[PDB]
Amino acid sequence: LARVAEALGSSEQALRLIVSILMGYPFALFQRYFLFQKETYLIHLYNVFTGLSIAYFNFGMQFFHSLLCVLIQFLILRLMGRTVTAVFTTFVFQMTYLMAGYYFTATEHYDIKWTMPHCVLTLKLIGLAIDYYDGGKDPELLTPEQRRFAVRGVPTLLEVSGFSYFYGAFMVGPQFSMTDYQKLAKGEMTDVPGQRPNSFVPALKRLSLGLLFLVTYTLSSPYISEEYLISDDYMEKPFWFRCGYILVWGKIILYKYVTCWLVTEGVCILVGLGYNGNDQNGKPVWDACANMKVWLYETTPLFTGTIASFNINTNAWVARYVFKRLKFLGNKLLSQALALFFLAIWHGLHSGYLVCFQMELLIVIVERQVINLVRDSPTLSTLASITALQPIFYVLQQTNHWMFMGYSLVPFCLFTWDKWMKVYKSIYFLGHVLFFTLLLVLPYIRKLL
Amino acid sequence: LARVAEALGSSEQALRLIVSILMGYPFALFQRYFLFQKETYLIHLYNVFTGLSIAYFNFGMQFFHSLLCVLIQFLILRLMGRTVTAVFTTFVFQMTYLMAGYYFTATEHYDIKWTMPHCVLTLKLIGLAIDYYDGGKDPELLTPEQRRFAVRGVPTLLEVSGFSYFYGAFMVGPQFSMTDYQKLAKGEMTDVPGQRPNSFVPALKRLSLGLLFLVTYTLSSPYISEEYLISDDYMEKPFWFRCGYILVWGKIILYKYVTCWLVTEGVCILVGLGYNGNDQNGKPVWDACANMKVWLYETTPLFTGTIASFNINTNAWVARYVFKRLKFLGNKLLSQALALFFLAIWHGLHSGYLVCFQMELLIVIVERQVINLVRDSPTLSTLASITALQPIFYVLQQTNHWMFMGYSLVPFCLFTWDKWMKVYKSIYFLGHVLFFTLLLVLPYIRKLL
Ligand SMILES: CCCCC/C=C\C/C=C\C/C=C\C/C=C\CCCC(=O)SCCNC(=O)CCNC(=O)[C@H](O)C(C)(C)COP(=O)(O)OP(=O)(O)OC[C@H]1O[C@@H](n2cnc3c(N)ncnc32)[C@H](O)[C@@H]1OP(=O)(O)O
Ligand SMILES: CCCCC/C=C\C/C=C\C/C=C\C/C=C\CCCC(=O)SCCNC(=O)CCNC(=O)[C@H](O)C(C)(C)COP(=O)(O)OP(=O)(O)OC[C@H]1O[C@@H](n2cnc3c(N)ncnc32)[C@H](O)[C@@H]1OP(=O)(O)O
Ligand SMILES: CCCCCCCC/C=C\CCCCCCCC(=O)OC[C@H](COP(=O)(O)OCC[N+](C)(C)C)OC(=O)CCCCCCC/C=C/CCCCCCCC
Ligand SMILES: CCCCCCCC/C=C\CCCCCCCC(=O)OC[C@H](COP(=O)(O)OCC[N+](C)(C)C)OC(=O)CCCCCCC/C=C/CCCCCCCC
Numbered sequence A, B: 001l002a003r004v005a006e007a008l009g010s011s012e013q014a015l016r017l018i019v020s021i022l023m024g025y026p027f028a029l030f031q032r033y034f035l036f037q038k039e040t041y042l043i044h045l046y047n048v049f050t051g052l053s054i055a056y057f058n059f060g061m062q063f064f065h066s067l068l069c070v071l072i073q074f075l076i077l078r079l080m081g082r083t084v085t086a087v088f089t090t091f092v093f094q095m096t097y098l099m100a101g102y103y104f105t106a107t108e109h110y111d112i113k114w115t116m117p118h119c120v121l122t123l124k125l126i127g128l129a130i131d132y133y134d135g136g137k138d139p140e141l142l143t144p145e146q147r148r149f150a151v152r153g154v155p156t157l158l159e160v161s162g163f164s165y166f167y168g169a170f171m172v173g174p175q176f177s178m179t180d181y182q183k184l185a186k187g188e189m190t191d192v193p194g195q196r197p198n199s200f201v202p203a204l205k206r207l208s209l210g211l212l213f214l215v216t217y218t219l220s221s222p223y224i225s226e227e228y229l230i231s232d233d234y235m236e237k238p239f240w241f242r243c244g245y246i247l248v249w250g251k252i253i254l255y256k257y258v259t260c261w262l263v264t265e266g267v268c269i270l271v272g273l274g275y276n277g278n279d280q281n282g283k284p285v286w287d288a289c290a291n292m293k294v295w296l297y298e299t300t301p302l303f304t305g306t307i308a309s310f311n312i313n314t315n316a317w318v319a320r321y322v323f324k325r326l327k328f329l330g331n332k333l334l335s336q337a338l339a340l341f342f343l344a345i346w347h348g349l350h351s352g353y354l355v356c357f358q359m360e361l362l363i364v365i366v367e368r369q370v371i372n373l374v375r376d377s378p379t380l381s382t383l384a385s386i387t388a389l390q391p392i393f394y395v396l397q398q399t400n401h402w403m404f405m406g407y408s409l410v411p412f413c414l415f416t417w418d419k420w421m422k423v424y425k426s427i428y429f430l431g432h433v434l435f436f437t438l439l440l441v442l443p444y445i446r447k448l449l
Helices: A012-022 A024-033 A040-058 A063-078 A084-105 A115-135 A159-164 A179-185 A202-220 A240-248 A253-271 A312-323 A332-346 A352-373 A380-384 A392-396 A401-413 A417-425 A430-448 B012-022 B024-033 B040-058 B063-078 B084-105 B115-135 B159-164 B179-185 B202-220 B240-248 B253-271 B312-323 B332-346 B352-373 B380-384 B392-396 B401-413 B417-425 B430-448
Strands: none
Touching (some): A012 A040, A012 A253, A024 A040, A024 A253, A040 A063, A063 A159, A084 A332, A115 A312, A202 A253, A253 A401, A312 A332, A332 A352, A401 A417, B024 B253, B063 B115, B063 B159, B202 B253, B240 B401, B312 B332, B332 B352, B352 B430, B401 B417
8 A cells, every 4th residue: 555655756645646537537427427317406416526525535634625625615605795895804804814825834845735736716705705796786888808717696595605716726736616516517508519529639638748748857857956056066166057957857847737737727628517618610618628739838038928828717707807807006016016916826935936036037127118118119120120040039049038937936935035036146146136127228228219 | 411310210211201292382472572574484384393393302303294294295295186086196195104103113002112103193183184175076065164174175285294293293282173283273263362472271280280290190100100010029829919019000001192292282272272152151262182181081881981082082083083974884882893803903903902992892882882771770779879878889889980991001011911811811801791791781780671
């Protein structure tokens, strides 16, 4: 039992998480094979039982926390449903519950535990509360992309339990809305585009690609190391070696996430929740619940071309439920700073997340300024119009996006001020000084030309 | 020097604070004797010099913190003066500066230091920012008590420095607005009600009363003790003795504040800032800058009769700049809870202030419910109309307000969860259980009759 559990250099918790994630396929197959049920309560109870069983298997003494959390949530949502006080009360309650969880947890390296499922659950649930409050407004246009996306005040006595504890998107899965779940519940998501289809092209391809990334990461894992950053053995002697190591790093840690999300996607594609219609050619498209892009993620030089292709669901949720809801402050920068601060507090332990997200804001602002300036000058346009040879558009432009990505990703994997600063000072604070110089130089030359 | 500094059981810091507070009278006399100055910059420079000298005398390495704080404040107020972003930015900046100060300070017992002057300064300065933002609105009625109280957008290049560093109300003094300070600056506060008047009846009486309370407190100080609560020597054996001790306590700690505020009042009465007009009889009244009431403070049985007579200035400021500015949430209880939470965060170290203010909210709600129910019943009105003898209105009603006052004041002087809980459990959590029972009983009997 335990002899082979930790045999291949794996802890007791990572293997448990990976087997729990992989165990979603048989449940989806069982549900799809038995679809002749015409009563929704059976599906709801099945989802609740499967979610609770998975939570028990992962850790058997902490699921009652999330159970009482969702219980209190719909208990308080039943009363004062449309009141503006309700949304603020549920926001404060959920945020303080998560913050107390982090404060009393005090994890050190990763320590896979209840925190991730509770975090996903609470963000999805705050989204549900916002949607319910908005759905009680007047039926007019109101940014017409909302009526298809907002609940119509229907009773939610039991659907909230099954919606919260979905077996597919429980650990790190997507964060779909409420209306699509209700459409799935009583069997009208696909009349005949996807009853039998597909389970052949999309799901198998996604599973195979996830397995490919997983084997690549586990083959490249022992060769590289993370604690070598702290260690001083033949590291502080050369300079360019440190930059090259950080460049090679950062592009390898991210894969740790990638595989995971991809395999979760497969489960959804098997259920049918990913359907959103068909294109002009008439072929149905399933790229609606996707969390990553196949190709654009790793073949984009622009800084802003990654935040739109790394994780679609969380970024889209933040854009939808912060920017569109905080337009009464007359400054876009303040709204962006508030959104990034909220995203930092979402999973921020001590200091690494704050500095990482501040740095990210700095890159996005600098990139927007630079891209605005180019192709907007009487003289620089001709220089940029040189298209016979493009050395700048070549590898010269790249191998700098990855370097700053690793530079801003270092505080993410080391969130203690001592280790953070000790490993971050040896690179001479290159990114901050370089971007401060650039940010103070561009306005003057822009005014010059 | 130091032989007599600590001779009478006094630390090096309390004596410094008391001598600094008392040293305000000679400066006021010097200013009043030389009033023929027709230029405001001389008065402003005099106020700044006196305030900086007092700050240097109290502690000589930390005043630059407040100097840079006020500098940054009016630097950021110069730009985007009327923008809604400015008020939120200054609010966040001041609050986070004070919170960082408390977090990096980590005081234990009282440890008189920079924190109190910085706290008073930052609250006054946030008030100034709110006033400046409001003054840029339309000139209509707008709760007509505001035009006399709001600035009219006049330049504030130098008046902010003299206003912030007033020598009178610097440590624990009052928190007067901006317009009255400007009226005082160029000499039109009193044309001839108070050029020579008075400095005889008001100031001397206030000083004498403050000295009387001070000598009473210092005579009753060594007889009683505070650490006896922690000590178990012949304390945990009897029960009624603990309640009697807490009753006698609480009424003695408050005097520690009282004297202080009173003596500060004297300084203001000498300057002339306390004038607000005259009554119907024509005699001028100086009870405008007062921070305590002479008689109503200690001769009121009602719970709500103390929050309107303990400290007028801070309570009035909180009522003016929170309730009147947070009416867009449709629930009074939420506004009250937010105000009390802000007042707790104002000077809250770890836990005692939060529980103290929550308890205070509970008493005020319970008292309002009880006073609403009485004299509002078909049958209980006759019982309450018995006026031949009033044992209830006698000492029976009192000796219970003081007891709950001490019960809710215990966590204020012991703000560490260990000592707090250890001294608070021995009284069997009497207040919380009694008021929970009363709060759950009154609605049913109210519906009954
Ligand atoms: C290379 C760049 C980044 C490099 C990475 C650096 C650090 C990396 C940090 C973490 C990476 C490491 C591990 C990540 C993996 C797992 C950890 C979880 C963390 C994440 O996985 S997270 C990754 C980044 N995480 C973000 O979070 C960044 C993006 N997050 C945003 O939020 C963005 O900002 C975005 C792109 C969504 C918005 O970008 P945008 O600015 O282009 O949006 P846009 O302007 O196009 O929209 C126009 C609409 O603004 C509204 N509008 C106008 N004026 C307004 C005003 N005055 N006030 C308010 N609203 C206003 C109008 O209503 C209009 O609406 P309409 O369309 O109808 O006109
Ligand atoms: C015995 C009771 C307390 C016992 C003490 C227990 C614990 C003691 C705690 C500390 C004591 C120890 C040491 C203290 C010494 C130094 C430490 C510093 C701490 C202090 O030194 S601190 C002491 C207490 N510290 C407080 O802080 C309590 C009071 N602090 C408040 O804030 C109160 O609450 C108050 C009385 C000021 C307000 O009392 P209130 O409720 O009677 O006011 P009211 O109703 O009369 O005003 C009607 C107006 O509400 C507005 N309005 C209506 N509906 C609304 C809605 N839906 N939303 C928003 N606004 C609405 C309308 O606009 C209307 O305006 P209009 O007049 O035009 O009609
Ligand atoms: C614009 C912001 C300016 C930043 C403000 C700077 C605050 C730091 C200032 C003064 C602290 C002096 C402390 C007095 C003593 C307290 C000790 C303490 O407790 O402190 C510890 C350290 C000092 O070491 P030690 O004396 O104990 O050495 C002892 C030897 N040994 C190394 C073996 C441990 O103090 C430190 O250095 C603290 C190092 C950093 C800690 C906080 C992280 C800063 C966060 C930056 C991100 C802000 C972005 C916000 C906006 C986000 C938008 C998305
Ligand atoms: C409605 C609110 C419900 C309250 C939530 C309760 C949270 C407490 C819960 C669970 C904590 C279990 C902890 C697991 C271990 C972590 C240790 C820790 O770090 O914790 C320490 C203590 C436990 O002692 P130990 O194991 O270390 O003993 C060791 C032996 N020895 C005594 C020598 C030190 O944990 C404690 O007991 C904590 C005691 C209290 C600390 C926070 C104070 C509560 C605040 C209440 C006011 C809320 C009002 C808000 C609204 C304001 C409106 C104006």
